[PDB]
Amino acid sequence: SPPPCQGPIEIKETFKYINTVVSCLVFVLGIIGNSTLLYIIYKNKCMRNGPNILIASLALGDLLHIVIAIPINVYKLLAEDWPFGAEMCKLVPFIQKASVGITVLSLCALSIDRYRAVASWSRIKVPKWTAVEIVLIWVVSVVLAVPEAIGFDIITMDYKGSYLRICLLHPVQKTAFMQFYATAKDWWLFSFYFCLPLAITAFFYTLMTCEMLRKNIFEMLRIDEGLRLKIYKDTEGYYTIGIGHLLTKSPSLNAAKSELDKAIGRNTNGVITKDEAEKLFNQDVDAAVRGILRNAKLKPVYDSLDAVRRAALINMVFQMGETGVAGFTNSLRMLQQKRWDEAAVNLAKSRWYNQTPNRAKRVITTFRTGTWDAYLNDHLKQRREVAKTVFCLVLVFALCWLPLHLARILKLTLYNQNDPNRCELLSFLLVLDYIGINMASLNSCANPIALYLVSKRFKNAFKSALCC
């Protein structure tokens, strides 16, 4: 019923050579990297307890994935006919997808653990239940990768004059569930093993970054302004509370209690909590941000800046009126053009600097360096570093595993049995699959190295680890 091809199924020898080189390099480098990670974790008995066990599980998944995926695909590219038997035809995809699941789940859980270790307002602590979590990860991985070991089989055929022994997921199946699995395996993999953890870790990372922004601006304004839980009359002669939250310009302390209760949602009697002050400060921050974007003098400057410099500008808009910050047309010009040091020297000459030198110096340092170094302590900074490293790792994953999934999706979406010259697309997909294997093994190889990349602790570990 389907006509044959005038064009053959072929792979150019140039791609064969270059891809074998790439695959061999990836294999050796990944073996070495994951083995060294495991060795330094094994010799590190003091840090054996902690989140290091998730690194151990991730490296184990990486090493297993490399060991199973690289040589068999090298052989499939070279010998183009395999003698290992239906035992291996069922065994290989099983362990392969099990290792894929181990890697995915362990990396996602590491990123979630890093979101947990940085945040506040948490539980008691991580200590013990994460090992049961490792058992769950490996068990769910092995269970999910079972339809692979059930549906694969070896078939033979006489093709254009040759007796071929093909190992594949059988296009016809005994179970009705296995038929649906053969139909939608690529969709299942693309959703669960790629889209799901990518989106979950992206949600967690966005949550973490917003939480960090709020807590850091709270720390900054606490240091610069001051935290008072009881009503007081500020310098300009008006009642306020919290972190400089004006209640009313009218001289009635009772009419100020009225507005305070109207804001907090309870009978306060002029006294609030540290966390209620934090919620009110978040409300004030959001109100300032919304007002700034309605000021044509301040809106493009705000839209130009990053998060930390936005927070410094919000600090300034807290201290002085919105029009007061609008009165800095020169320094705002320099900040919008990202001329940091010149804006610093121009702000250090203002009246605002001379009246409030401490706050001015810290805000100007924030503008120049673009960091929270003036306010926060080093524990928070190391936590941020580690979290951002793990997130960059999930990004490396999401970009390395995309081509293989996309090649499978293209095979599912564009193949038409009736086309005579479809074998062009077939050879194309062959090259794409042999490239996607390399990309996946490259991610699972660079996990330890890319962890070394943007983390000082793992840079030190990579420096020290040598022979044994």
């Binding site: 019923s1 389907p2 044959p4 068999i72 078939i155 093709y159 296009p171 016809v172 077939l426 062959l430």
Partner: peptide, 21 residues
């Protein structure tokens, strides 16, 4: 890989040459 049915020999030869995934 897989194919829709066994009637297509070209996709079978593909999965003979294809990677194992």
């Amino acid at each position: 890989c897989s194919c829709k049915d066994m009637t297509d020999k070209e996709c079978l030869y593909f999965c003979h040459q294809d990677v194992i995934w």
